[PDB]
C-alpha cells in the first residue's frame, strides 16, 4: 500500500510490541525500492533486532540446557532438536534481512552515514549466522561478517567524526566480532580502546542530537574492555 500508511502501522506495531508485524511492515516499505529515510531505517532496524533477538535469546537458553544435560540422554536429545528448530528460524530471519540489504539498502545508500549503517548491519546479521553456524560455533559466513564490518570501518574512519554514534556503534560491534567470533581478545580490546580513547579526546564534538547515543556507546565500549580484561 502507500508508504506513509505502512510506516504508521509499523509504529503502531512497535507500540503494541508486535515485532513481527512491525518487521513485515518495514520489509514492505523497503521492497518499494526507494532509499529509506532515517526514520524508516531506524524502524526497520528495531523491528528486525527484536525478531532475531527473541531467537538468539531462546537459542542461548536451550543451548545452555543442552550443555547441562550432558549424561541425561532423553533430556539432552530433546534440547538438541529444539535448538535445531530454533536455529532454522534464526537463519531464516537473518537471510531475510541480508537479502533486503543486498537488493535494496546497500545499493541505494548514497550518503556515507547510511552506507556505514547498512554495512554494519550486514556484519551484524552475518555475525548472528556465525553464532550458530554449522561446525557448532563458526564457519565461512565469518568472512562475510568480517568484510562487511571492515568496509564499514574504513568508510566511517574517513567520513565521520570519532564521537558519531554510527561510527562508535560499528567499532563496538566489530570488536565484539573479534572477541566472540574470532576468539581474539587482544585485537577486540585494541579496537574498542582506540574508539573509546579517540571519542573521549573529542568530547567537544558531541552534538545535542547525538549526545545521548554517543555517550551510551562510549560506556558500552568501556564496559566491554572491563569485561574482557577481567583479571587484575
Amino acid at each position: 500500500m502507500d508508504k506513509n500508511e505502512l510506516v504508521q502501522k509499523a509504529k503502531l506495531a512497535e507500540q503494541a510490541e508486535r515485532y513481527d508485524d512491525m518487521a513485515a511492515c518495514m520489509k514492505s516499505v523497503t521492497e518499494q525500492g526507494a532509499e529509506l529515510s532515517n526514520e524508516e531505517r531506524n524502524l526497520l532496524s528495531v523491528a528486525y533486532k527484536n525478531v532475531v533477538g527473541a531467537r538468539r535469546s531462546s537459542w542461548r537458553v536451550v543451548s545452555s540446557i543442552e550443555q547441562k544435560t550432558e549424561g541425561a540422554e532423553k533430556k539432552q536429545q530433546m534440547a538438541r532438536e529444539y535448538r535445531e528448530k530454533i536455529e532454522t528460524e534464526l537463519r531464516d530471519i537473518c537471510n531475510d534481512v541480508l537479502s533486503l540489504l543486498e537488493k535494496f539498502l546497500i545499493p541505494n545508500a548514497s550518503q556515507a552515514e547510511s552506507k556505514v549503517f547498512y554495512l554494519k548491519m550486514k556484519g551484524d546479521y552475518y555475525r548472528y549466522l556465525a553464532e550458530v553456524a554449522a561446525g557448532d560455533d563458526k564457519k565461512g559466513i565469518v568472512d562475510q561478517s568480517q568484510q562487511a564490518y571492515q568496509e564499514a570501518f574504513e568508510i566511517s574512519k574517513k567520513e565521520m567524526q570519532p564521537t558519531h554514534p554510527i561510527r562508535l556503534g560499528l567499532a563496538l560491534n566489530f570488536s565484539v566480532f573479534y572477541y566472540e567470533i574470532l576468539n581474539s581478545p587482544e585485537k577486540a580490546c585494541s579496537l574498542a580502546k582506540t574508539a573509546f580513547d579517540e571519542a573521549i579526546a573529542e568530547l567537544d564534538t558531541l552534538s545535542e542530537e547525538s549526545y545521548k547515543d554517543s555517550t551510551l556507546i562510549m560506556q558500552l565500549l568501556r564496559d566491554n574492555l572491563t569485561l574482557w580484561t577481567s583479571d587484575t
Binding site: 528495531v46 533486532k49 563496538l172 560491534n173 565484539v176 566472540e180 556507546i217 558500552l220 566491554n224
Partner: peptide, 7 residues
Amino acid sequence: RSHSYPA
C-alpha cells in the same frame, strides 16, 4: 556477555 549496539 559482550555488549553490542543497538541492544
